């Protein structure tokens, strides 16, 4: 296995809570597919008549185009659409979850054929949540060992998602904040992931969608709000992050016309945010950073929104803790020697931090870097005066880039150890 070989045939797979990012090291950007599968059950004979036999026999479809093909036909898709990693962990005995993960592992390899004889298998590098227990590592290794009989696979390794971000950013000493649909992971990196400093929050992009849905109902779009794809489009289009929420709300109630907006959902369907509710745009961006505001609590009191802790194995995911407090807690839980190395660089990653400021709104609205700096200046002025905060260039692709760098560089002489939790396995 030469150096040139590894620059062609390293293959990265990032298993996100809502999207899998995947493909060879030679791609300029990864491909993406939703982390879900559709079971084909209870279908009318009218519909089943025109489905290929091999697909009907399999009874489970993955791939965005393919799931879209059959979604209209399934009447009850809450029961039949399975999301195996919606909180980052597939439970040990959840057989449907692990079947969907194996099908996704198969589909992603199947998108990249062979046409060069000096190829003898991929070198696969998989990224999983820092929340993943030991049994998840074993089950993922098992999936790729089984698929090695269907595809040429030379070697396989696994690493945690926050470490991959640090590698992609060329940052050996830092604090990573990685936020997707399901949760936020906060972890210090000093030549390795410092486990004792991991802090997890039970909020993500799903919470921004949840409050968008409730705003839409209040405006009068309850029927639209029942469609998850539509809530997602509205969230991305109209969400705003305040510099400081109370100041942003006062501005939008004094001059609501600055903040009214419209969203086209289809050639026929359009949504309008009117004057009375224009200020609520700031709730959609704020909720991931800090949910402790009366205007958010109002929906909780109505039993229309949940903000709560969760427990997965040995880790508690905190519902209410704000992002700044999580950074400060993470540092407190590691030694002073490590703190002095990593506290200089805070790095935000993941799609939940993608927010942009519309032209003209710089007085009241913020991007994620600014919102986090404001929070740190309030809760720890000393830290704030010495730290640099940044957002990765491609928020959804950073983990995958670090996975392919890791797979390229990790020595092939380093065999997997259950004790150190690093190394290669060879099918």
């Amino acid at each position: 296995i030469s150096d040139a070989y590894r620059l062609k045939y390293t293959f990265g797979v990032d298993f996100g809570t809502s999207y899998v990012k995947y493909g060879p090291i030679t791609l300029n950007e990864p491909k993406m597919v939703q982390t879900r599968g559709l079971f084909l059950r209870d279908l009318p004979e009218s519909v089943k008549m025109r489905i290929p036999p091999d697909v009907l026999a399999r009874g489970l479809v993955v791939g965005d185009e393919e799931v879209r093909k059959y979604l209209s036909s399934v009447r009850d898709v809450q029961r039949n659409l399975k999301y195996p990693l919606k909180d980052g962990v597939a439970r040990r005995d959840d057989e449907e979850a692990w079947r969907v993960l194996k099908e996704l592992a198969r589909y992603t390899l199947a998108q990249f054929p062979v046409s060069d004889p000096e190829f003898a298998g991929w070198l696969v590098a998989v990224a999983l949540s820092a929340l993943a227990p030991d049994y998840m590592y074993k089950a993922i290794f098992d999936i790729y060992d089984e698929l090695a009989s269907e595809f040429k696979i030379y070697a396989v390794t696994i690493l945690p998602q926050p470490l991959a971000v640090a590698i992609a950013e060329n940052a050996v000493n830092c604090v990573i904040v990685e936020g997707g649909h399901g949760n936020i992971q906060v972890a210090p990196i000093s030549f390795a992931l410092i486990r004792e400093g991991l802090v997890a929050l039970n909020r993500g992009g799903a919470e921004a969608n949840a409050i968008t849905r409730e705003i839409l109902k209040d405006i009068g779009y309850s029927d639209i709000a029942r469609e998850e794809y539509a809530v997602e489009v509205v969230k991305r289009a109209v969400g705003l992050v305040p510099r400081r929420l109370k100041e942003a709300i006062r501005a939008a109630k004094s001059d609501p016309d600055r903040f009214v907006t419209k969203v086209r959902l289809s050639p026929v369907v359009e949504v309008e945010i009117p004057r009375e509710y224009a200020w609520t745009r700031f709730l959609i961006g704020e909720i991931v950073f800090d949910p402790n505001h009366e205007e958010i609590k109002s929906y909780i009191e109505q039993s229309r929104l949940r903000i709560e802790n969760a427990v997965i194995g040995d880790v508690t995911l905190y519902g209410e803790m704000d992002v700044a407090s999580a950074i400060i807690t993470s540092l407190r839980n590691v030694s002073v020697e490590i703190q002095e190395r990593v506290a200089s660089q805070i790095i935000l990653s993941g799609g939940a931090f993608s927010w942009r400021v519309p032209p003209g709104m710089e007085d009241v609205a913020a991007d994620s870097v600014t919102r986090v700096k404001i929070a740190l200046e309030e809760k720890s002025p000393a830290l704030a005066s010495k730290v640099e905060v940044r957002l990765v260039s491609e928020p959804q692709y950073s983990v995958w880039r670090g996975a392919v760098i890791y797979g390229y560089a990790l020595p092939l002489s380093l065999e997997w150890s259950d004790t150190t939790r690093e190394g290669w396995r060879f099918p």
Partner: peptide, 16 residues
């Protein structure tokens, strides 16, 4: 963001 300048490459290649 190039591989040649990435300090992690030397760190990872040193592992035994």
């Amino acid at each position: 963001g190039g591989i040649g300048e990435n300090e992690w490459v030397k760190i990872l290649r040193s592992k035994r």
